[PDB]
């Protein structure tokens, strides 16, 4: 009765519409084991939230800074706090955060307390959905937003891969790729840039250098699946 990924079809037996965003799409059988479904239900939400923050990261950076290109912007920021002091903070400050999230996955009733401010405590929530501090002023129904998080999330995970594969083919940001498509739609598609006939394979070259210098030792910058491109 629920909407599906393909309306004439039937959902598989392990998908019964219990979970948010459950449109019945799992052709490869991956939601069969219920031990491993919890791991994937967590990892879809984590993959979505980083990608929502990344796509809105590139879109905000492109509308305020037309100078630098985001694929190259991990190289040119010139922080005064060192190249590896940043990585040292990010390593420790995420090896705290993720392991708290991981222990919440393993035992859900084990991570609720502020360890250094024990007067404060998280509410006994659902796994992957902390709330309490992480969720003030929730608008409307919570399960409505729980589907809005994944629909915008799944749209953004396809968006970031669309950002990367446009950044390796035309090498410009995703409004500059949009301005290439809106100035000339009939010639600026991937079907226009490439075709494989049985007898020759015409693929675009990289708009990406093979390596970069970056302060001494060189860093390899490969085009993600160059050679297997159409």
């Amino acid at each position: 009765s629920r909407p599906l990924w393909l309306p004439g079809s039937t959902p598989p037996a392990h998908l019964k519409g219990d979970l948010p965003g459950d449109f019945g799409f799992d052709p490869l059988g991956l939601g069969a084991n219920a031990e491993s479904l919890k791991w994937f239900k967590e990892s879809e939400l984590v993959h979505s939230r980083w990608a929502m923050a990344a796509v809105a990261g590139i879109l905000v950076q492109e509308i305020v800074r037309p100078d630098v290109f985001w694929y190259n912007a991990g190289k040119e920021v010139e922080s005064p706090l060192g190249p590896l002091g940043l990585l040292a903070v990010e390593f420790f400050l995420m090896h705290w955060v993720e392991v708290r999230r991981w222990q919440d996955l393993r035992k859900p009733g084990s991570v609720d307390q502020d360890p250094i401010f024990s007067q404060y405590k998280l509410p006994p929530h659902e796994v992957g959905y902390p709330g309490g501090v992480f969720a003030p002023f929730i608008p409307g129904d919570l399960a409505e937003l729980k589907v809005k998080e994944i629909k915008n999330g799944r749209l953004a995970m396809l968006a970031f891969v669309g950002f990367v594969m446009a950044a390796q083919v035309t090498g410009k940001g995703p409004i500059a790729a949009l301005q290439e498509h809106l100035a000339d739609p009939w010639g600026t598609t991937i079907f226009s840039k490439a075709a494989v006939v049985p007898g020759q394979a015409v693929a675009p070259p990289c708009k990406i250098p093979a390596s970069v210098s970056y302060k001494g030792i060189e860093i390899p910058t490969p085009c993600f699946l160059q050679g297997l491109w159409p």
Binding site: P7, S192, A195
Partner: protein, 226 residues
């Protein structure tokens, strides 16, 4: 069902006249599976209806202009006035996605006959689908159905089967001599002994490749020989 494809032939047991155009045929056993007979019925309707557009394309594109040749009408130099030297990669991008919608909706009408009838965007008017392969409703803007439907359902195939053979004729009367169907009709009706099936079977007027904007094509005739 009767008046079969040959006089003394017993019709097969699965061809008792239910489907239209049923002539006790299939001397290759392909409709013996009941689940395969429906799909071969759907693929017969597709091969009929595209050929009826194909025949009505080829002998109309040379009545409106007997200049652009239908074998090389796909080359961008031969496209009309707003489309001359279009990017074929862009036009294939339209056609692929516009057809991967339509066909998969038709394909799911095969796989689940009944859960694909509604306009999915506008939950409004449905399509009343009486039987598989015959959607109707908005595919009948003239209301020419809802009469003796079985009579027109036979007329669709008999015109369709002839159009399949005529369109494979339209190709083989074009690779053998490099000439259009009404143009090979003129070539026959001028000298009906030097422009027959003889002395043109065994010569292929098609090159090994015609380059399209940086792409080669294998371009094979349906028999060897040049």
């Amino acid at each position: 069902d009767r008046k079969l494809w040959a006089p003394g032939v017993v019709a097969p047991e699965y061809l008792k006249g239910d489907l239209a155009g049923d002539y006790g045929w299939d001397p290759l056993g392909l409709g013996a599976d009941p689940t395969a007979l429906k799909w071969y019925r759907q693929s017969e309707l597709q091969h009929a209806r595209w050929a009826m557009l194909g025949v009505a394309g080829v002998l109309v594109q040379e009545i409106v202009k007997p200049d652009v040749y239908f074998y090389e009408a796909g080359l961008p130099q031969n496209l009309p006035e707003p489309f001359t030297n279009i990017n074929m990669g862009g036009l294939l991008a339209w056609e692929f996605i516009l057809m991967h919608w339509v066909e998969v909706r038709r394909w799911q009408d095969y796989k689940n006959f009944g859960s694909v009838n509604e306009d999915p965007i506008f939950k409004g008017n449905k399509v009343p689908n009486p039987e598989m392969g015959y959607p109707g409703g908005i595919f009948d803007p003239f209301g020419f159905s809802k009469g003796n439907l079985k009579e027109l359902q036979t007329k669709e195939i008999k015109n369709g089967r002839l159009a399949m053979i005529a369109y494979m004729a339209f190709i083989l009367q074009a690779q053998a001599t490099g000439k259009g169907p009404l143009a090979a009709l003129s070539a026959h009706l001028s000298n009906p002994f030097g422009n027959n099936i003889l002395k043109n079977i065994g010569t292929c007027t098609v090159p090994h490749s015609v380059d399209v904007q940086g792409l080669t094509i294998p371009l094979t005739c349906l028999w060897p020989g040049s």
